[PDB]
Each structure stands twice: as C-alpha cells, then as structure tokens.
C-alpha cells in the first residue's frame, strides 16, 4: 500500500524502484493580454523519475509543443507522465524494470496504473512523505536543460553524484531531501549557501559541488538552520 | 393464471412473491400463491421466522412448467420442484382452491410496478447467470457471491454476471489509455453491448435482475453488479437516446420500490453521486434525480 515513515528502508533494498514526480510536467507563467484579461503561457516542463537506491534520474523534458491544441492540460499532464514512465518501463530489459513505482502526488495513481495494465506485477503506490522534488528545477543543471530543449528529450543524470562512493543509499537519499527541502524553502539562501565558497566547485559531471565528508557534515548543518529558520520567519517564532 | 402450491408449512416463515410479502405460522394451514400473472418471470422467496439469516428463492416463469414447494426436513428450507404429471397438479391445485387454502397475487389494476421493475428480465438469461440446468427455475440467497467477487470461492453456487471493470485491458484500448478511462463509450458501446450483451435489451436485463437480487436478498455482488451497469452508461459520453430514456425509466421505478429503510446500505453514495451531479449523463435522468431528490436527499 502506501509509503510512509514506517516503512522507509523498504527504498534501499534490492527490489528495483523508482519515485515518479509530476509537479513539474506542466509548467506555466500567468499575465495579463492586451485587453487586460489573463492567460497562461505554458514553458519547458519535466517528469522526475528517480531510482532511490542507484541514484539514477530518468529526466524526461515534456517540450511546450505537446500541449499545443490541447484542453484541460493539467489533467493531460497527469496521464502524458504516465504515458512516458509506461514507455519507459517498456524501454528497460526485463531485469532492469522496477518491482513498484511510487507516486509523489495521489493523483497519478489512476493515470499510472491504466498505463501499466500490460504489467500487472508492478505495483503501484502513493506515498505519505512530503517528498521536496518539485525543487529538482531549482539545481541549476536539470533547470538548464530542461529550459534549452527544443523538443522532447530524455536526459539521464545520477542525483547522488559519486556519493554512493563513501556513504549509503540511506544518508544519500537523506542528504538529497534535505539539500531539495532547503532549496524549496528558500532558494536563495540554500544556494548562497552552496556556493559562498569558490574554491569548491562542481565537477563536469556533477549536480553539486565536490565537498569533503567534513564539508558537507558542515553543508547539512547549515540546512538544518534555514529550514529552522524560515520556520520561525513563516511562523514567528 | 398460475399457481404455485405448497405442501405444507411446517415451520414459520416470511415469504415473500415479488415484492409483496406476508407472515405464515408454524404449521398454519397454507396450501401456496394463486393467481400469478402469466407473463413474467417472478420470485418466491423465504425468511425463516427463526434464522433471519438466508434470505433464499426462486426465480421461475410459470409458462414454463408446473412448480410448488415442498419443505425439506433434512436440508431445512422449502424447495421449488417442478411437477411433471400435469394431471397430478391440476388436481391438487384445484383441491386447494375449492378449500380457499392459497393467498391471492394481488390483482390492483393501475400499475405495472412488477411490470417495469422486470421489462427485459427474461428466464433464459437468469439461468445463464445462475446455472443448475436441470432445474427450470433458479435458485438464489443472501450469501451467493459472483464470478467477479470468487477473482479477488465454489464455483458451481456463483452469480455469473459479465464481468465490468474499469481499470482492465479489456476496458482500455492500447494508445487510448486516458480517453477510454475518462468516457467508457468504447467499452459500453463495442465491448459490452455489440460484444457480449449484443442489445441493450440484455444489458438492461441484467441490470435489473442484479438490482432485484440485491434488494430481495440483500446480496452484496448483485448490489455491486447494478451500481457497475449503472455506472458504465452514466460514464459514457455516447449513448444510444433510446437507452437514456429507458435507464431513467428502469431507476425511477427501482428507487420508488426500494425500502426506505434499507437506502442507506443499497445506494453507494460515490457512484449516485457521480452519476447524477459529475457524470456525461447527469442531465439525463430527470425522473430518476428528482425522486432521488426528493425521497433520499440525505444521500447526495
Ligand atoms: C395481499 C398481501 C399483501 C398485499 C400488499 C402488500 C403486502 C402483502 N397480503 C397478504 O397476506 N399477502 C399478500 O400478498
Ligand atoms: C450490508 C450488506 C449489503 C447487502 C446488499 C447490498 C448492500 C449491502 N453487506 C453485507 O455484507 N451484507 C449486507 O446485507
């Protein structure tokens, strides 16, 4: 059934699976026309598909010209992510499709399963974590990408960098949500935070920068604060 | 007009002929039901004073044999049997009735409640549905469960009504996964009713025949199978006119009979819901909302 606090570590066994977002799928700046009405001008969108063990991303661009001529587009967002997790699935050798696929949102439950009929041994499931992925369009490269494509493209990236290196998918994963919570809370300050020292940079093939084990023990801290932080700056106290 | 004798009446029971019903007692001197209208499939049915559990009956047309009932001692229910000495049963019938041991069908001569509730109700699809093919008539009680319920367990006692699901390949065309999901009217229209029911006549029949199951015995599958026949139309955006008028016909009637009593476990809140006020067709069934409206208003 559902994902929840209880039954966390079930993410870092060896059942292959992946978290699906749709919260960027279908993405849209509001303005006024002309005659002082308002409209919507849809931009470059995303699906986040992520593997919580391996690190791996399936970063589907959901390019503005799907939704040319179409209606009720937050809808059709909703089954076009599971139209292109299904034909993702589809694209994978057997012993690499996921055992379950986790929803962020309720809302694609419906859309998913319909599209996973042909794979009935997949489950499909909600989550009650308030997962932070919507942010994933706030690390500068996935926002670059995304934003520079002229037509669909998949683009495949590990979120985890070469963490996996030194640290369990555990704290991997527990570093992601929190650097992604912080970010969602107050981009500017989690970046500033990031990136106040030049002297670490982020590698060619990296999302984040190159921090020492010490380095980041530091980084999380200074998380923590600013999520603390606006806590109290949202809530006063 | 038929007649369906009884043997005896040795232990107390309610029976129940269509949707009449009236107490006998232990032992009372009851010889059965005359003056059944030819015509129409009917329903005798029982509660036993004493295990109110089990509603059970039968479901039969007199056009097609002799029956009566007859008390079984051992597996302790009254049982159709079908006479085949047509002489033999004239005889007792009319015995019976020249001592005025049978209560009468009730003969009101203005409308056709029995009538509309069993429109496309035929005898040949209720057997298909419960099979004992030996017998002409067909048996059912509270606790039978369906072919879909036995998916998610004897098969030979189900209700094998056609299987309706909204989230299976064979409601989903490949490609049109949103579309099919959203207006049913591919699988209404091709797979159900040209595929399997091939005429809304069946289709209907079938309805019905689950709703009466549903309420005369309280069976939680027929109630499940109504509510999904309704629920496949109302959520198609291309129905036949004729069938939209009909369905509101066939409802208003099936909520006028219901017990007031009973409304709050025979109607699934979520499915009226959507069917009158969200659905394609909650603007198509005038006579069945405004009695909704006005007898169970609680419900929506
Ligand atoms: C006339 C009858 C009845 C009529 C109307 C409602 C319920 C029962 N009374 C009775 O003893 N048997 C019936 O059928
Ligand atoms: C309430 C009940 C039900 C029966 C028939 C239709 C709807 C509800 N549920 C169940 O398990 N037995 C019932 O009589």
């Given at each position: 059934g559902a994902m929840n606090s209880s039954n966390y570590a079930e993410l870092f066994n060896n059942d292959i699976k992946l978290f699906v977002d749709d919260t960027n799928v279908?993405?849209?700046?509001?303005?006024?026309?002309?005659?002082?009405?308002?409209?919507?001008?849809?931009?470059?969108?995303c699906i986040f598909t992520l593997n919580p063990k391996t690190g791996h991303l399936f970063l589907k661009?959901?390019?503005?010209?799907?939704?040319?001529?179409?209606?009720?587009?937050?809808?059709?967002a909703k089954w076009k992510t599971a139209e292109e997790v299904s034909a993702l699935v589809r694209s994978l050798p057997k012993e690499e499709q996921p055992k379950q696929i986790i929803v962020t949102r309720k809302a694609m439950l419906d859309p998913l399963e319909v599209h996973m009929l042909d794979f009935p041994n997949i489950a499909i499931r909600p989550t009650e974590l308030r997962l932070p992925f919507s942010?994933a369009?706030?690390?500068?490269?996935?926002?670059?990408?995304?934003?520079?494509?002229?037509?669909?493209?998949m683009?495949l990236f590990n979120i985890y960098?070469?963490?996996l290196?030194?640290?369990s998918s555990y704290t991997a994963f527990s570093?992601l949500t929190?650097?992604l919570?912080?970010?969602?809370?107050?981009?500017?300050?989690?970046?500033?935070?990031?990136?106040?020292?030049?002297?670490?940079?982020?590698?060619?093939?990296?999302?984040?920068?190159?921090?020492?084990?010490?380095?980041?023990?530091?980084?999380?801290?200074?998380?923590?604060?600013?999520?603390?932080?606006?806590?109290?700056?949202?809530?006063?106290? | 007009?038929?007649?369906?004798?009884?043997?005896?009446?040795?232990?107390?029971?309610?029976?129940?002929?269509?949707?009449?019903?009236?107490?006998?007692?232990?032992?009372?001197?009851?010889?059965?039901?005359?003056?059944?209208?030819?015509?129409?499939?009917?329903?005798?049915?029982?509660?036993?004073?004493?295990?109110?559990?089990?509603?059970?009956?039968?479901?039969?047309?007199?056009?097609?044999?002799?029956?009566?009932?007859?008390?079984?001692?051992?597996?302790?229910?009254?049982?159709?049997?079908?006479?085949?000495?047509?002489?033999?049963?004239?005889?007792?019938?009319?015995?019976?009735?020249?001592?005025?041991?049978?209560?009468?069908?009730?003969?009101?001569?203005?409308?056709?409640?029995?009538?509309?509730?069993?429109?496309?109700?035929?005898?040949?699809?209720?057997?298909?549905?419960?099979?004992?093919?030996?017998?002409?008539?067909?048996?059912?009680?509270?606790?039978?469960?369906?072919?879909?319920?036995?998916?998610l367990?004897?098969?030979?006692?189900?209700?094998?009504?056609?299987?309706?699901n909204?989230k299976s390949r064979?409601?989903i065309?490949?490609?049109?996964e949103?579309?099919?999901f959203?207006?049913?009217?591919?699988?209404?229209?091709?797979?159900?009713?040209?595929?399997?029911?091939?005429?809304?006549?069946?289709?209907?029949?079938?309805?019905?025949?689950?709703?009466?199951?549903?309420?005369?015995?309280?069976?939680?599958?027929?109630?499940?199978?109504?509510?999904?026949?309704?629920?496949?139309?109302?959520?198609?955006?291309?129905?036949?006119?004729?069938?939209?008028?009909?369905?509101?016909?066939?409802?208003?009637?099936?909520?006028?009979?219901?017990?007031?009593?009973?409304?709050?476990?025979?109607?699934?809140?979520?499915?009226?819901?959507?069917?009158?006020?969200?659905?394609?067709?909650?603007?198509?069934?005038?006579?069945?909302?405004?009695?909704?409206?006005?007898?169970?208003?609680?419900?929506?």
């Amino acid at each position: 059934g559902a994902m929840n606090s209880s039954n966390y570590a079930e993410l870092f066994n060896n059942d292959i699976k992946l978290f699906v977002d749709d919260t960027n799928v279908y993405r849209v700046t509001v303005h006024k026309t002309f005659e002082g009405n308002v409209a919507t001008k849809a931009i470059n969108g995303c699906i986040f598909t992520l593997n919580p063990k391996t690190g791996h991303l399936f970063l589907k661009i959901i390019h503005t010209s799907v939704w040319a001529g179409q209606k009720r587009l937050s809808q059709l967002a909703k089954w076009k992510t599971a139209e292109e997790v299904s034909a993702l699935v589809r694209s994978l050798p057997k012993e690499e499709q996921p055992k379950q696929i986790i929803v962020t949102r309720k809302a694609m439950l419906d859309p998913l399963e319909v599209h996973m009929l042909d794979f009935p041994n997949i489950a499909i499931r909600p989550t009650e974590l308030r997962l932070p992925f919507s942010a994933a369009m706030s690390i500068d490269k996935l926002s670059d990408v995304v934003m520079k494509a002229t037509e669909p493209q998949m683009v495949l990236f590990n979120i985890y960098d070469d963490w996996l290196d030194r640290i369990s998918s555990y704290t991997a994963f527990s570093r992601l949500t929190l650097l992604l919570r912080a970010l969602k809370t107050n981009e500017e300050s989690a970046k500033m935070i990031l990136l106040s020292d030049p002297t670490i940079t982020i590698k060619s093939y990296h999302l984040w920068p190159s921090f020492t084990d010490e380095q980041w023990i530091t980084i999380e801290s200074q998380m923590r604060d600013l999520i603390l932080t606006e806590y109290g700056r949202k809530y006063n106290v | 007009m038929n007649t369906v004798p009884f043997t005896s009446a040795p232990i107390e029971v309610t029976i129940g002929i269509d949707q009449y019903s009236f107490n006998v007692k232990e032992n009372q001197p009851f010889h059965g039901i005359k003056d059944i209208p030819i015509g129409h499939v009917h329903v005798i049915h029982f509660q036993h004073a004493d295990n109110s559990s089990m509603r059970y009956g039968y479901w039969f047309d007199c056009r097609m044999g002799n029956f009566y009932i007859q008390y079984d001692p051992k597996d302790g229910l009254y049982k159709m049997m079908e006479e085949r000495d047509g002489a033999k049963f004239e005889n007792i019938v009319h015995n019976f009735k020249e001592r005025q041991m049978m209560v009468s069908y009730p003969k009101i001569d203005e409308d056709d409640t029995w009538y509309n509730l069993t429109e496309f109700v035929q005898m040949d699809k209720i057997r298909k549905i419960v099979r004992k093919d030996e017998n002409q008539f067909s048996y059912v009680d509270s606790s039978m469960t369906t072919v879909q319920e036995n998916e998610l367990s004897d098969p030979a006692h189900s209700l094998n009504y056609t299987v309706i699901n909204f989230k299976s390949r064979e409601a989903i065309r490949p490609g049109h996964e949103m579309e099919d999901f959203l207006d049913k009217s591919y699988y209404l229209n091709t797979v159900m009713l040209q595929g399997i029911f091939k005429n809304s006549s069946n289709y209907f029949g079938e309805l019905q025949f689950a709703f009466l199951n549903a309420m005369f015995f309280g069976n939680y599958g027929s109630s499940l199978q109504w509510h999904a026949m309704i629920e496949l139309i109302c959520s198609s955006a291309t129905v036949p006119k004729h069938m939209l008028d009909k369905l509101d016909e066939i409802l208003y009637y099936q909520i006028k009979t219901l017990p007031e009593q009973y409304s709050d476990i025979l109607l699934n809140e979520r499915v009226w819901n959507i069917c009158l006020y969200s659905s394609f067709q909650k603007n198509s069934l005038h006579n069945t909302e405004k009695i909704m409206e006005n007898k169970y208003p609680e419900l929506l």
